Ligand binder design. Structure first.
Ligand SMILES: *[C@@H]1O[C@H](CO)[C@@H](O[C@@H]2O[C@H](CO)[C@@H](O[C@@H]3O[C@H](CO[C@H]4O[C@H](CO[C@H]5O[C@H](CO)[C@@H](O)[C@H](O)[C@@H]5O)[C@@H](O)[C@H](O[C@H]5O[C@H](CO)[C@@H](O)[C@H](O)[C@@H]5O[C@H]5O[C@H](CO)[C@@H](O)[C@H](O)[C@@H]5O)[C@@H]4O)[C@@H](O)[C@H](O[C@H]4O[C@H](CO)[C@@H](O)[C@H](O)[C@@H]4O[C@@H]4O[C@H](CO)[C@@H](O)[C@H](O)[C@H]4NC(C)=O)[C@@H]3O)[C@H](O)[C@H]2NC(C)=O)[C@H](O)[C@H]1NC(C)=O
Ligand SMILES: *[C@@H]1O[C@H](CO)[C@@H](O[C@@H]2O[C@H](CO)[C@@H](O)[C@H](O)[C@H]2NC(C)=O)[C@H](O)[C@H]1NC(C)=O
Ligand SMILES: [Zn+2]
Lengths: 47, 49
């Protein structure tokens, strides 16, 4: 089953923490965040 | 008396572009501001609404 929230069942091959978003702010990147995938650009925001 | 149909003159400042009756008409209608100048930035600074 796929959930819109975080997906906590992942294979070990997909276990990584390549969270270098600070250096990749101004670039279109492929993101995979807790089972959520897509493409986009991250802008520093306050919330 | 044609006061409401005329645009009020102002001695100092910015000239007005709406009459009294036009101001009454526009205030009764809710229209969203389509961010002509800085909508792209405002949609990020304001958050989801
Ligand atoms: C030839 O024809 C030319 C074109 O017709 C004409 O040039 C035009 O002259 C007029 C009058 O001089 C200019 O109007 C003025 O525009 C100012 C800037 O507007 C823009 O920016 C604001 C946001 O402000 C930010 O940016 C400005 C710089 O751009 C900066 O100065 C400011 O500090 C901010 O950083 C923005 O809100 C404006 O857009 C909205 O209004 C437009 C209409 O004016 C809409 O079309 C647009 O969709 C926007 O609409 C939304 O927002 C409004 C306001 O909330 C809502 O009503 C609406 O529903 C919608 O949500 C635009 O991008 C503007 O600041 C200035 O404002 C003053 O005057 C008007 C009218 O009297 C008042 O309503 C304002 O409150 C304000 O009044 C007082 O002004 C004095 C002096 O400036 C201030 O000291 C006071 O504080 C202020 N009082 C208050 C309470 O705020 C006015 O609209 C116009 O820009 C020129 N157009 C050009 C150059 O292209 C030219 O004169 C003609 N020549 C001859 C010879 O006749
Ligand atoms: C013409 O009509 C205007 C309104 O369209 C009148 O102005 C109003 O006057 C009253 C009474 O003094 C005030 O309380 C209002 O605030 C005014 N409204 C405005 C200025 O929008 C004006 O008095 C009328 N003229 C005459 C000669 O009767
Ligand atoms: Zn940006």
């Amino acid at each position: 089953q796929y959930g819109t929230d975080t997906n906590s069942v992942c294979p070990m091959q997909a276990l990584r923490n390549d969270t270098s978003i600070e250096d990749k702010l101004d670039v279109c990147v492929e993101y995979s965040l807790h089972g959520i995938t897509g493409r986009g650009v991250f802008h520093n925001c306050t919330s | 008396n044609l006061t409401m149909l005329q645009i009020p003159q102002v001695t100092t400042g910015e000239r007005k572009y709406r009459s009294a009756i036009e101001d009454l008409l526009f205030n009764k209608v809710t229209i969203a501001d389509p961010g002509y100048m800085q909508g792209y930035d405002e949609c990020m600074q304001q958050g989801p609404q």
